[PDB]
Amino acid sequence: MFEARLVQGSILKKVLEALKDLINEACWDISSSGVNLQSMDSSHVSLVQLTLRSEGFDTYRCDRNLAMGVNLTSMSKILKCAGNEDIITLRAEDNADTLALVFEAPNQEKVSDYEMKLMDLDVEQEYSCVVKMPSGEFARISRDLSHIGDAVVISCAKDGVKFSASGELGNGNIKLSQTSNVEEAVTIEMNEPVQLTFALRYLNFFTKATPLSSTVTLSMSADVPLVVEYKIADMGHLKYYLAPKI
Numbered sequence: 001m002f003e004a005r006l007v008q009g010s011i012l013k014k015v016l017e018a019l020k021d022l023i024n025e026a027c028w029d030i031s032s033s034g035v036n037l038q039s040m041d042s043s044h045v046s047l048v049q050l051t052l053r054s055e056g057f058d059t060y061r062c063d064r065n066l067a068m069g070v071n072l073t074s075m076s077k078i079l080k081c082a083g084n085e086d087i088i089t090l091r092a093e094d095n096a097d098t099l100a101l102v103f104e105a106p107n108q109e110k111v112s113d114y115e116m117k118l119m120d121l122d123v124e125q126e127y128s129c130v131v132k133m134p135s136g137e138f139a140r141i142s143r144d145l146s147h148i149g150d151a152v153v154i155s156c157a158k159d160g161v162k163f164s165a166s167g168e169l170g171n172g173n174i175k176l177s178q179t180s181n182v183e184e185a186v187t188i189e190m191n192e193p194v195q196l197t198f199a200l201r202y203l204n205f206f207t208k209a210t211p212l213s214s215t216v217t218l219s220m221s222a223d224v225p226l227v228v229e230y231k232i233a234d235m236g237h238l239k240y241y242l243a244p245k246i
Contacts, residue, residue, distance in 0.1 A: 002030050002066055002092040005059035009088030009103070011212070011232060013079045015050060018209035018230075018238060020076040022048060027123040030066035030092065034236060038124070046202045047225075047241035056235030058087075066096045069121025078114045086112075127221040128192035129156040133176060134184055135216040135230060139207035141174050146200055148172045151245060156194040156220055161186070165200065183214040194220050196244040203228070206240040 006012065019026075022041045026048075029036040034057070037050040054060040082088060082103040091100035096118050103112035141163050145152050149167030156162075164173040179185045209230045210216075219227040225243040232238070 001061065001063050001094065002096075003059060003061045003089065004035065004054070004057045004091075005087065005089045006057045007087050008233070009082060009086045010084045011052075011235060012088055012090075013082060013084070014209070014211045015052075015238065016072060016076040016079050018212060019048065019050070020072045021208060022046070022205050023072050025069065025071050025119065025121065027121040028066070028068040028070055029123055030062055030068060030096075032062045034060075035090070041202075041205070045199065045242070046205070049239040049241070051236035051239075052232070053236050056232075059089075064094045066092055066094075067121065067123040068092065068096050068099060069119030070099070070116070071119070075116060078116060081112065081114065092118075126224050127219050127227075128190065129194045129218075129220040130189040131156065131161050131176075131218040131220070132185075132187040132215055133161075133218070134186075135207075135210045135213050137176070137186075138216040138218070138228075139210045141176075142200065142203045142207050144174065145172065146204055150200055151197050152200045152203065153195065153197050154218070154220060154226070156188065156190055158188070158190050158193075161188060161218075194222060196220060196222065196226065198226060198242050198244060202240075202242050206242070209238050209240075212238060 023039050026039040034053040039048050087104035089102040099116040099118050101114045145165040148165035153164040160175050160177040162173050162175050176186045206228045213230040217229040225241045228240040230238045
């Protein structure tokens with residue numbers, strides 16, 4: 001029997017809000033280490049890696065490893081049924097055919113309990129630049145550049161980070177410079193200059209995880225796909241991997 005109880009239950013809601021638009025069905029790895037997910041998107045161009053460590057949960061028990069095939073949209077709806085301040089418990093048997101979601105109330109007078117059905121889905125350091133910026137600012141830049149073109153050139157040097165886009169109506173570039181504050185500051189760790197090109201649609205998909213964290217981390221290098229990382233509040237992390245265009 002697997003049982004995970006988490007007081008801050010909004011975290012799950014936010015995670016699936018970030019994921020429902022990217023992956024339709026996915027296999028959750030349930031272990032003594034926590035809740036994990038590794039998957040491609042429906043268009044097979046990007047990679048999503050979600051980690052929620054067991055220590056971050058209020059109660060955690062995982063007798064056997066579980067490979068829960070889940071339709072992320074259905075689970076997102078069911079989590080929509082939960083209140084933002086509810087306590088969320090995920091429960092499964094060793095033969096995980098049903099998943100149980102328990103939503104607890106303030107004065108223990110409302111107790112929602114939903115049961116999903118799981119499917120038989122088999123589960124399947126080089127970096128020159130690291131930018132830490134506000135998650136809202138990254139989402140804003142992605143949304144803004146979406147109007148200009150389909151591909152974004154991210155340039156990273158010791159002077160700042162630039163997001164450029166070109167398309168039918170013209171071009172456009174945004175320049176973020178490091179600040180003096182140093183979750184509202186922009187910080188650049190550049191060990192080698194970097195100039196790469198990525199699909200803006202997938203970046204806008206990644207930015208759906210903005211409510212999970214106030215800061216986003218863009219880890220960039222010429223030979224590896226970009227990593228967009230959102231750190232949760234003292235729990236796991238959501239990492240998106242997107243290959244640079246040739």
